[PDB]
Amino acid sequence: QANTVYKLAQARN
Amino acid sequence: VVDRQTGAVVALNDLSVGRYDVTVDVGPSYTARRDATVSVLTNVLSSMLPTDPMRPAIQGIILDNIDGEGLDDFKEYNRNQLLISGIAKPRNEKEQQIVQQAQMAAQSQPNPEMVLAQAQMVAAQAEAQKATNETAQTQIKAFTAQQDAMESQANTVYKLAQARN
Amino acid sequence: VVDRQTGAVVALNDLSVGRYDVTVDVGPSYTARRDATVSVLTNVLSSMLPTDPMRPAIQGIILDNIDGEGLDDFKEYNRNQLLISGIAKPRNEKEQQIVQQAQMAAQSQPNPEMVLAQAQMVAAQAEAQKATNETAQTQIKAFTAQQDAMES
Known part of the structure; x- marks a missing residue:
């Protein structure tokens, strides 16, 4: 869950 | 209250004791107390059905009071078996x-053995x-999977939002 | 109502009591009450089948009342067995x-033992x-799976 939240933040670029 | 005594330098008779609670009667003449005990116990026996439970106890008590020559080992064995049955009340020596x-230790020790004689259900119950x-x-795995499912729902909702670019 | 007792420094005879409720009869002559009790119990015996349930209790009652020399241990054991079966009514000493x-402790103790003696059903019931x-x-999976389908 934490890693996927980080990935969501990252996909914003 | 469980004992009797009388004692005096010269026998003292207290006139305030009064009449006793004993009744005079006639009966068979016995040379020794063992003969009287054996006769009474034998009279008690032979009037009961052979399958009665107290018959072994009566028999043991009868053979315990028998006096004879060279019967010391048998008397000791019978007394030991009478103690094992909790009847003789050791005379504190x-x-x-x-x-x-x-005997208490030998009754406590085979307790696991006698419970194991039919304790095959213990494995199943454990x-x-x-x-x-x-x-x-x-249930714990289902709850964790539900949390992962809502997390993936949020993940893919964000993925749909970002996919519009 | 359970106790017969009268008290008087010099015997009081209450004239208002009236005639008793007993009847005068005749019967066998006994030297002691133990003889009468033993005779009555023996007469009761020999009149029922050997397989009746009350015969051991009556036998215990009879052996309680019998007297003799050197019977202390046997009488103690018989009285103990009679007390255990709830018949002797301990005289509160x-x-x-x-x-x-x-006896109550050894009744409460082996209830788990006796249920264990036949309790192979307990595991299945547990x-x-x-x-x-x-x-x-x-079913929990069934509701959660519904989301994993509508979401997709």
Whole structure:
């Protein structure tokens, strides 16, 4: 869950 | 109250005691108390059905009072078997602390053996009881999977939002 | 109502009591009350089948009342057995809290032993509780799976 939240933040670029 | 005594330098008779609670009667003439005990116990026996439960106790008490030559070992064996059955009430010399300890320990020690003689259900009950605490791991896994499902719902909702670019 | 007793410094005869409720009859002559009790119990015996349930209790009652020399241990054992079966009615000096206490303790103790003697069903019945957690897991999955389909 934490890693996927980080990935969501990252996909914003 | 469980004993009798009388004592005096010269026998003292207290006139305030009064009449006793004993009744005079006639009966058979016996040379020794053992003969009287044997006769009364034999009269008690032979009037009961052979399948009665107290017949072995009566027989043991009868053979315990028999007096004869060269019967010491048999009398000792019979007395030991009478102590094992909890009937003889040791006269507080050596068998109240050694034989009593021995038989209580010998009744406590084979307790696992006699429970194991039919305790085959113990394995099943232990398995079921610990399953009663483990198998809830299925519910825990379901809860974790539900949390992962909502997390993936949020993940893919964000993915749909970002996919519009 | 359970006790016969009268008290008087010099015997009081209450003239208002009236005639008693007893009848004068005749019977066998006995030297002591133990003889009468033993005779009555023996006459009661020999008149029922050997397989009747009350015969051991009557035998215990008879052997309680018999007297002799050197019978202390046997009488103690017989009285103990009679007390254990709830017939002797301990006379509230020490047995009601020693031997009766031992009997109630040894009645409470082996209930698990006796249920264990035939309780192979207990594991299966305990399992029924576990399936309440285990089987519903498929239903819990059924609702959660519905989301994993509408979301997709």
